[PDB]
Symmetry: C2
Subunit: 251 residues, 2 copies
Amino acid sequence: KTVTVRDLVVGEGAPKIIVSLMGKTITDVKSEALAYREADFDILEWRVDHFANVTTAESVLEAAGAIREIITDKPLLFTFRSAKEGGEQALTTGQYIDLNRAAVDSGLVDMIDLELFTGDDEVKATVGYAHQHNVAVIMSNHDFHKTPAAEEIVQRLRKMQELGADIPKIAVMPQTKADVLTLLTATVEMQERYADRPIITMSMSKTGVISRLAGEVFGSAATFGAVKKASAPGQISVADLRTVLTILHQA
Amino acid sequence: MKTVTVRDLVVGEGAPKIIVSLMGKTITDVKSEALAYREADFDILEWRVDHFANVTTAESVLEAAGAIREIITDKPLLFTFRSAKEGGEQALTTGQYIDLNRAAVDSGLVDMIDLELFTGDDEVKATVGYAHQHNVAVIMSNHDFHKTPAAEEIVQRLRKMQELGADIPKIAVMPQTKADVLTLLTATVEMQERYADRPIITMSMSKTGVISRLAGEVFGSAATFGAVKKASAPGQISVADLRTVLTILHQA
């Protein structure tokens, strides 16, 4: 099964390119958005944790509106990555939920990222809320230190499906070359045996970069590239990412 | 591991080296292909001798080898007779295959020969020693066009190759499933990290296994085959595109 967001069909054809916008202020958000129009991406992720005024609703809303006005074609993914999973700042569970609910209610965003480890009650409720306002949910988990066993990676991914995620997502850090392969094996087992929707997976750092390139074969429906700045280790430039995906899609 | 130097090319260091296969039936085909390949961006030229129509006529093989060496002067030359039993273009008895390879060594025109792991241990050891005595490196190989053996069998084959004197163990396998591609890569990592004391070449064939032809720098395959115009195996991509991907991965 696939997920359609603003006419982009995720889980079909070549993996979709996502780029993260990281602006600290409304001014930086506007200039970054304008500059990003030159890049060949499919989905724009707004990394809200990089934004300085995250607790001022009116400010968050104004920035989302600015992005939506500059980037009118592409799906917009609203992602507050918590400090706990590699993000720039922390919020209370309540703050995090209200933030995402406000994004959903604004009509400015097509998708939201919800971290699996937020709490089942909270995730369930917010997934329900998102779906009531036609907003898709990428449910995510990140491990910046290590790569868990394939079985544990699959366990997380299925729990994400179980909680109603439109797109389960997991990012792990390899400590060895074999760790890259463990992430790929979990991806294939999930996609072939248990998934009834698209999944996004990556092995981070330069070492796992191959996981960001071969999703068309192995099962990851989307991959992140960098415009000028990486939002995670291992991301290569969007132009290079497009070149490689294109070669693999036509090879 | 110890690197392997063929002419001025150091295999096993930096980004994987690109090898391309020259396939011609007659001497006219060989000359025409060698001329067309002069423009191509590759590091090692493999002559797929099994494609050549008159491999049992020493003078014809020698002239063809000379023709290639006169046209392509600055790239190492790998002489490869891929046997029918290993998915090649013609069958030879063990004796004809060994005599052919020895003729290649004796010509002084080739820098490397490809010897198939399962030819027979006695024959392989004697031939490896002979190549070495004459300053010819040996890529030892094994191919399976239908399936991917267990990772542990793949590693055992690469290790047996080392045991038999191979300068560069090489194995090409075919994935039935996506997971099979990962099995080939697992075997590559295990071999390179725990057992290899020299460079190795590995690939999962077909489009499905193409990542194995691109990710050698991270996973441990020292060389990779691309196609100029016609592929010498399933899943090879054009040399231009192969170079582009390798450079991108090198600078990631």
